Symmetry: C3
Subunit: 314 residues, 3 copies
């Protein structure tokens, strides 16, 4: 199987500068090289270039909607492209509002796909709920069908087609939800696992269920949108919104791990890493690394070890 | 439902200066304000004043028994008072020996109450076991009936009436128990969950059981005495006795959380926060915050999120 | 029952200087004294002296094989000696390659013994796999029968007799396995619990199983080889190879704890503590302490508490 890496150095999703430097550090950590050492065929598509929409007017509170509309449109296309050739897309953020792109494009080639959203936040606000224009906190809105038209068309997103329903998505790691978002997720009966659930059930059962719940009947393709703020701030401190009492580096790898074992990975998102937001170098480095290790996890590497088949090490 | 906050800035329970500054910081963190933002009616009773008993003689080893007898007597009264009006009492320590007060008063209005003691220590020593006069390490002795008279009457506590039996209390978080205490807890067949049990069962099951065990038959009122030393020292470092390998910030919120969901909260204790014992500002701040968040937890706030009913955020 | 402590201040197993200072600090922390306070009879055999083999030639890549062959031979003997008298041997490292000794000697008196290897690493490389001469990363090779002769006889180890099979050993804590090692452990169908398994099952079940798996039929004696690098680097930072996302101080004590409860402890290994590798004093101190506490755990001390029988503390 093949693997194509895509950098989406973008940041117009939220107000903190750095996230675009994201994929830069991830590579500078040897993400590619390592990925190669695995049983997967890897290719680097380099980092997209995002033309800046002059005079981007703040559609209501929602900010820079046009810049975020073309960047996401351009991406989705690139994704659908590789998705076509049969390769697995590994998007590198860049803030999380690049999910709109990454997922839509993916959907094209596989509209039967299910999404697993490991994030501290739900990002399911619509332009009608947000308390900030930060689109990086709305992606699920532009993708959910049950929320189509539920808000004024947004400048630059016209190109998006709600590709998934509240029954094909699952949240893992939620711990800082806005009133509005809570309403919508309860109303649209979405399946999640907030820290309290993980706390209760145990990352073990969480996956166990999230799987049968999404792959009980027909086994579909999986799109893993991993928000690095989703692990606890001790483990991935360099982010836009640290939020305490989150997923642990272990549970983080327990998830990427069970997903790899299902053999249904098709698209991955390593978003929100902000190489500029580290209180000390080490912190940025911790972040980047646990981020990298999460990826390679998705593609093989088991904490128990890996031995290349057929060869007799004895 | 209503909520009345009471500060018990006291410290004669143990030898370290600061605990009295406790409720000061908790408020200075916005404990009140936040509490208001919830669905509960909150009122601040201000902080009690504790007249100092001149020439407080150390009844045997037990120290400052008289100062600790009037402070606790005065408190219990104030508690029973609000307990009468039907409001939920939220005592802010101040060391943990203020439990004698807080609980006794509460008992008055509801003598059917059950107590959940989240603490690293059991504090069940009698004046006959302690290796220190530190009363903050004996509270359960003055409240347990099965231990009534089992020790020489103490100067200043004469006013206390053993209000609960070893079958209405449950410990969660024990990890540093004195020989004597261990004897007594085993002898009086008390129900606990030491770190090893939590370790084994999982905070999930722990509550699950502690509940049925205390509310299997008749559903009574709950008194949550939370000792901030009870979470691990990483999470609530600013305390009298850090003790490693304790409850985690998550499990800490998983507990306050399931208790809120039972709808049986009647009295709460946020004890031992010592704003002076932080190796660095941050530490004191971590402490205070996780302390505050534990409270608001008890009163509503879920890590999944909260949306005010009736309103359509869409 | 009796307890004899043995120091194996050795370091030729790996390239980092300090590990030999190991048992020195462990004692200097009061390991002995504390052990005495327990219900066990303790005796200090002092620290062995390890004659240095002049001109130790690096058998292929494998380094200092002769120094490591006599130190391990001398040890095994001392162990078998006390094992004979019926006492429980508590070896203090010194690097982990002293397992070859400690276990072999033990095997002598009880060849039916089972081994529980709490380590981050498997150390099951043969002189034919290692990428370093570091013998401290091969011990299981010289002890496994299914690996006997599978590699060129090594200078100084000729005296060792493969004493256990891949069905009497169990790994707990694995998280940094070399290709070769992974091959061998899979091939020889060994029973392990990598961090991912612990992650999934929960230290609770892990033991539960490892026990029945090793003591389902016939209850044998247990040899606990505990590698301090096995807990996460936050908790036991002063080591040769920190490796993130490992066993926690709690799970660490949950293990030593359930092993004590089986009453089948016969030999213990507190290896790899390097009092020189601490980024700050505190770190070395954390290490040593959690190391000490792990031991006393093995011999009684429960986090719930301990009361000397027959005595009425009331
Ligand atoms: N960092 C994130 N998401 O990844 N924050 C989301 C917060 C909020 N819901 C918003 O739209 O601003
Ligand atoms: N910090 C506490 N309790 O909250 N310590 C209790 C220790 C001991 N049992 C005593 O009475 O001194
Ligand atoms: N610290 C350890 N083991 O305890 N490292 C083992 C690493 C490697 N397998 C080796 O032989 O070098
Ligand atoms: Mn997000
Ligand atoms: Mn987020
Ligand atoms: Mn206490
Ligand atoms: Mn305590
Ligand atoms: Mn080892
Ligand atoms: Mn190791």
């Amino acid at each position: 199987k093949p693997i194509e890496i895509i950098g989406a150095p973008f940041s117009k999703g939220q107000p903190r500068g750095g996230v675009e430097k994201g994929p830069a550090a991830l590579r500078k950590a040897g993400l590619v090289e390592k990925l190669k050492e695995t049983e997967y065929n890897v290719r680097d598509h380099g980092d997209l270039a995002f033309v800046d929409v002059p005079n981007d007017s703040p559609f209501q509170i929602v900010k820079n909607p046009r810049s975020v509309g073309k960047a996401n449109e351009q991406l989705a296309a690139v994704v659908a492209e590789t998705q076509k050739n049969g390769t697995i897309s590994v998007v590198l953020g860049g803030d999380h509002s690049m999910a709109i792109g990454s997922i839509s494009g993916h959907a094209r080639v596989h509209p039967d796909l299910c999404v697993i959203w490991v994030d501290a936040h739900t990002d399911i606000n619509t332009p009608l709920t947000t308390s900030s224009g930060n689109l990086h906190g709305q992606p699920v809105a532009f993708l959910l069908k049950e929320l189509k038209g539920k808000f004024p068309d947004v400048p630059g997103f016209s190109w998006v087609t709600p590709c998934i329903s509240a029954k094909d998505i699952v949240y893992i790691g939620l711990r800082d939800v806005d009133p509005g978002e809570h309403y919508i997720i309860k109303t649209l009966g979405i399946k999640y696992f907030s820290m309290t659930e993980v706390d209760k059930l145990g990352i073990g059962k969480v996956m166990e269920e999230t799987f049968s719940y999404l792959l009980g009947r027909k086994k579909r393709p999986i799109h893993l949108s991993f928000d690095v703020d989703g692990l606890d701030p001790v483990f991935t401190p360099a982010t836009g919104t640290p939020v305490v009492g989150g997923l642990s580096y272990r549970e983080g790898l327990y998830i990427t791990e069970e997903i790899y074992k299902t053999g249904l990975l098709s698209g991955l998102d390593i978003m929100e890493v902000n190489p500029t937001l580290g209180k000390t170098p080490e912190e940025v480095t911790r972040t980047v690394n646990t981020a990298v290790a999460l990826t390679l996890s998705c593609f093989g590497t088991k904490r128990e070890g890996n031995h290349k088949p057929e060869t007799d090490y004895l």
